[PDB]
Design a protein around this ligand. Structure first.
Ligand SMILES: Cc1ncc(C[n+]2csc(CCOP(=O)(O)OP(=O)(O)O)c2C)c(N)n1
Ligand SMILES: Cc1ncc(C[n+]2csc(CCOP(=O)(O)OP(=O)(O)O)c2C)c(N)n1
Ligand SMILES: O=C[C@H](O)[C@H](O)COP(=O)(O)O
Ligand SMILES: O=C[C@H](O)[C@H](O)COP(=O)(O)O
Ligand SMILES: [Ca+2]
Ligand SMILES: [Ca+2]
Lengths: 678, 678
């Protein structure tokens, strides 16, 4: 039941968002103007505590079409979050809390968006995480988890393949608490949708297993939008898409035109809009008291009240179920179980040679019972990635017979990019979720859109990237990574681990799991690598360390992954010719760089030529080495041992190159590459 | 109408592909065994000349599910292409002509596949190119172009978002000559499809505007498969999907199990299969004469004859229409119009400051009529990328009213990955097609799956990547590239141009268009950059050159794109303090690296500190510079001038750093970074 105040509220939102775009003289006025009625209706009906944006059982809202931020920021201020008019007045300004696109970092903003297709897929992960939480802690009498996941999306999000991957998955999993409202406005940047997007979205979504509702008058039908959302909530075993038709830039003189998509409305156009809406065309950033009063009563106070009930029920739960309550309390506090690192495996050079890919599996089998917040999966490569623990139950709808929602292993299908985004949503949900997904290192590139966002936002997700090099073999160049690590090591805020043996894999996993704001990629071998004499979790945890030392080395050999052993071998060959080579291992650039200069300079000193060894791109090595032995061309289809020989990665092949580096520099004074002038 | 021979032929294919996988003890036997009847039926009705795999009007076949390559190689041998039994016997072996996955490089292999989702999308580009060629050259009496584009795909292909993007577009464009046959076998690596893929593919396809035919018995209904393909050929205004049901590993003792997906069948299982099909279980790579005789008759001879008529028609055409015939002859010969580079714009420092994004547009306007093979487009950013020439007609179905198939501007929609693959297909088609597409540099990453393949196969496609840095401004970090160029400069075989002014944009375009085996990415600014005194097409064309020189420089400043001018300004500030700085411009790592050592060492010599300047990742600069001034962290939402200042990129900010580099090295003898020891 809506009244004049609801209508007063809707104009305040449209005008506030417009004022905000115009003051910055940069921005997107269109969608905010067309989606305002939907926001009012939706937010009014959401269970959230603006004073605790962290409440675990809060209804969650994702703005997939991020360019419409002015709408998100307006709502945040009006409903009582930590966002003032002053903040809105510095929208898009260097240093403001109001950047051009929503960032995870701010309270009320659930994930960072801007790149189309990412928010809808993130919301899918958020709903999977809810389904899991509820199935794991809910007990009769204690419904600790039951929140909904709402999303706003545009034609752009529906055009990007990633949202298709996620919607396919979403429908298979039968995520009925996921409700998406689609801004069907018929406009995108180039112009009208018919110019390149004339497909039947409704029919495509039903094919996924989704429910589709329609709202023909999204510009004014508040009760219609209200009914569509309500019916949507009855869809228990089907996620819902509400195709709501609106007019881009509603109220504007150029409404319905793509000119109102991404430019501040012209001043006179703004004046007429205000007037039309009963506002003084001469004043800006005006919020009628009646609107603050309305949201206070409809949202803020009932939400606070709900958060309070939730806390009492939870305290009762901790009384009735001490083990579960303690666990949920801990996950909610964001701590990992005490001394969990104790269950991590350690080795000696006495043990057998294992593919780092299998050592990884061993780790999983060892910590899965220690970490109930660990939820894994693979994008159709479970047996190649070795990413499933034996006692795992799959995350599937109960009606499948293959598993249930309390399951902790996800079958992603061949959808790397969606996996990347779903993982971000699971991480973004809370309760200390530690998601990881597996694929071949070469195909993580398919997910670069999502991965960059794991780094930008700081979601500590884990990629179990197997088949890291030409060691892959016969599959060939289309499968063998070359530029992969160099790429990811150029991206800020992401660990790119490439462990050499058992001890190094445990360090890769301890640092990745202990991480709170940095995602990770663990590049694992297909082939067998031996256990090194000199490795350790403590030393590998530093990102880089001296594996084998000599007094007065003639050369320092730095390697990663499968090349550490080869370098160890090359050093034996070199010792025979009386050349002393110190061998350094560098499992992670990121972690190593984080160490204090004096440590790093103790591993990579002055006055010693340093040559790196890694069967991938050499373009990133200049920051640690003087000379580099790598592969700057695509691979080959052949038996792995033969492919290595063909590229010169033979012990004596490496030794020859160390000898050439010593000769080349003999007589020169050398500076560690670590040293910078400014 | 099929007979015993057709049935003899299908058994030979199944067994030859199995023999090939077993011999290599590596490979995928499953799909080839279930798809054998379809291939036989399809290839038998394709118009192709095994003797000229380049004939422009040949029906084209793409194996989207590349792992099934044993089937493709079998067909190529049997039908008469340059592939012998000996070649088959070295499948997946180092150096053979039979690698683990199909590579464009081989005759009869239309594009490289392996990464799922790529072949289907490539095939779409091939049909767009066909439709364009026909609408441009066909005249009444002369149907020079009318071939079909066939594709084989699996569940994996349909799960990857890229095939959805492409199928959406394909349906919009109404590409009726594109026929896709789907291997609906219910199995993927992890197991049954129901475990994660239970959507209604048929209904999802109709939603795109495609026609879907069904074939229930793909294991043996030759006539049904034949009917499905025939009916498919009648759908002129709709692309066709034929959901053909089969059993993975048909004939194998483990048929229908995911165990037959990617492992050579067990020896005893191979014996029973051969026996079952009337073959001696003890002999391998056996091709009944009757099989050779059959394909010679039904395919090789008819095809050679078809190619012969085609050539006569064509010669008559060049008589009747001299202009068009000469052009087609030239494009076919793969030459660019003579002295086309004369139309390329040149500038002087007296010209106005323009964003290299606009300078780009200017080039397009100038060479569009010189190059009929130039077909451009944008992924919904036509006005930001400035990718449209004014006299352009859009590539759309005639019934749209917005254009027609002779159009040369494509509206890709928000589908970066599909654009990348569609471009590879248009390039792959022939007739000297020169495709280029635009998007923001930061979003080319969404397309890294296709881009890598442009490099691996050598498709010389062009990416007009605008908004190259924090110069983007207010849009913020989600849009400002940081790791992008460092990533693509680590990928083999791809020019990554970052032109500074008008003259450098012309060299970017000249090198890009003249390229026959190397794709390109032209990173263009949003902001205005002035015309440099010292630039030129000739010098810029070498990838790197001395822009400003001095006798006995105290330092060499190496910059790219927007930073060259800043460096030029920093040098002016340094001159004032009597420090001589030579300023070098590096618009392309790739191009420069291809130059002779002597040239490169003349640009970057010994005994002079070299400091690089570029507002992106510093991780790749150690190959040309001693010290680097770059940005190794995400950007900021603010006015571009302010974001640059904030990051220290001001003239005096750069000058200060040069001064620090000089002091740091004062007294040391320095070696140019270009010098390698091995
Ligand atoms: C991956 C990605 N591709 C492209 C863009 C650039 N972009 C921003 S909004 C938009 C199109 C707008 O489409 P839509 O979702 O319909 O929004 P509306 O115009 O309705 O506001 C584009 C191309 C982007 N930010 N990210
Ligand atoms: C981008 C990408 N990711 C993952 C894979 C690894 N892969 C290859 S085939 C396969 C899927 C099984 O595919 P399908 O097409 O389902 O198989 P078939 O019936 O022939 O077994 C997988 C996961 C791939 N080829 N490409
Ligand atoms: O979505 C819109 C874009 O981010 C923005 O409008 C582009 O502005 P510009 O093309 O002027 O850089
Ligand atoms: O699609 C199949 C994969 O490329 C292959 O079967 C993986 O083999 P592997 O897991 O033994 O490396
Ligand atoms: Ca829209
Ligand atoms: Ca399959």
């Amino acid at each position: 039941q809506f009244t004049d105040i609801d209508k007063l509220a809707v104009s305040t939102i449209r005008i506030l968002a417009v004022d905000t775009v115009s003051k910055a003289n940069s921005g997107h006025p269109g969608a905010p103007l067309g989606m305002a009625p939907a926001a009012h209706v939706l937010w009014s009906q959401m269970r959230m505590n603006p004073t605790n944006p962290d409440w675990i059982n809060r209804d969650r809202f994702v703005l997939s079409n991020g360019h419409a931020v002015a709408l998100l920021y307006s709502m945040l201020h009006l409903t009582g979050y930590d966002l003032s008019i002053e903040d809105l007045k510095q929208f898009r300004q260097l240093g403001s809390r109001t950047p051009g696109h929503p960032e995870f970092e701010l309270p009320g903003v659930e994930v960072t968006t801007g790149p189309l297709g990412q928010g809808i897929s993130n919301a899918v992960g958020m709903a999977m995480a809810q389904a899991n939480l509820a199935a794991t802690y809910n007990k009769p009498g204690f419904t600790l988890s039951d929140n909904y996941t709402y999303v706003f999306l545009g034609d752009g999000c529906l055009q990007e393949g990633i949202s298709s991957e996620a919607s396919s998955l979403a429908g298979h999993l039968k995520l009925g608490n996921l409700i998406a409202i689609y801004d069907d406005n018929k406009i995108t940047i180039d112009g009208a949708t018919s110019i390149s997007f004339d497909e039947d979205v409704a029919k495509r979504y039903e094919a996924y297993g989704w429910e589709v509702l329609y709202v023909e008058n999204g510009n004014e039908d508040l009760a219609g939008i209200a009914k569509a959302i309500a019916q949507a909530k009855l869809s228990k075993d089907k996620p819902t898409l509400i195709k709501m038709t609106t007019t881009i830039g509603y109220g504007s003189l150029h409404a319905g035109s793509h000119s109102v998509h991404g430019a501040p409305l012209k001043a006179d156009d703004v004046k007429q809009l205000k007037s039309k809406f009963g506002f003084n065309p001469d004043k800006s950033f005006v919020v009628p008291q009646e609107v603050y009063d309305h949201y206070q009563k409809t949202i803020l106070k009932p939400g606070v009240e709900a958060n309070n009930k939730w806390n009492k029920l939870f305290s009762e739960y901790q009384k009735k179920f001490p083990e579960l309550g303690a666990e949920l309390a801990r996950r909610l506090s964001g701590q990992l179980p005490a001394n969990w690192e104790s269950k991590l495996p350690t080795y000696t050079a006495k043990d057998s040679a294992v593919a780092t890919r299998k050592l990884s599996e061993t780790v999983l089998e060892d910590v899965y019972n220690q970490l109930p917040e660990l939820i894994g999966g693979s994008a159709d490569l479970t047996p190649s990635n070795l990413t499933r623990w034996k006692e795992a139950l799959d995350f599937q709808p109960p009606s499948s017979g293959s598993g249930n929602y309390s399951g902790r292993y996800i079958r992603y299908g061949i959808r790397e990019h969606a996996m990347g985004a779903i993982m971000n949503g699971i991480s973004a949900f809370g309760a200390n979720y530690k998601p990881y997904g597996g694929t071949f290192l070469n195909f993580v590139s398919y997910a670069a859109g999502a991965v960059r966002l794991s780094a930008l936002s700081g979601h500590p997700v884990i990629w179990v990237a197997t088949h890291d090099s030409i060691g892959v073999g016969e599959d060939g160049p289309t499968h063998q990574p070359i530029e992969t690590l160099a790429h990811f090591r150029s991206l800020p805020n992401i660990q790119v681990w490439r462990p050499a043996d058992g001890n190094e894999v445990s360090a890769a996993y301890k640092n990745s799991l202990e991480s709170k704001h940095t995602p990770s990629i663990i590049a694992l071998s297909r082939q067998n690598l031996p256990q090194l004499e000199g490795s350790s979790i403590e030393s590998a945890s530093k990102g880089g360390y001296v594996l084998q030392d000599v007094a007065n080395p003639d050369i320092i050999l730095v390697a990663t992954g499968s090349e550490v052993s080869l370098s160890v071998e090359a050093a034996k060959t070199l010792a025979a010719k009386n050349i002393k080579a110190r061998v350094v291992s560098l499992p992670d650039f990121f972690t190593f760089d984080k160490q204090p200069l004096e440590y790093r300079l103790s591993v990579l000193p002055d006055n010693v030529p340093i040559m790196s060894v890694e069967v991938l791109a050499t373009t990133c090595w200049g920051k640690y080495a003087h000379q580099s032995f790598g592969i700057d061309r695509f691979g080959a289809s052949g038996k792995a041992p033969e492919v290595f020989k063909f590229f010169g990665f033979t012990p004596e092949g490496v030794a020859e190159r160390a000898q050439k580096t010593i000769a080349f520099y003999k007589g020169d004074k050398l500076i560690s590459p670590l040293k910078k002038a400014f």
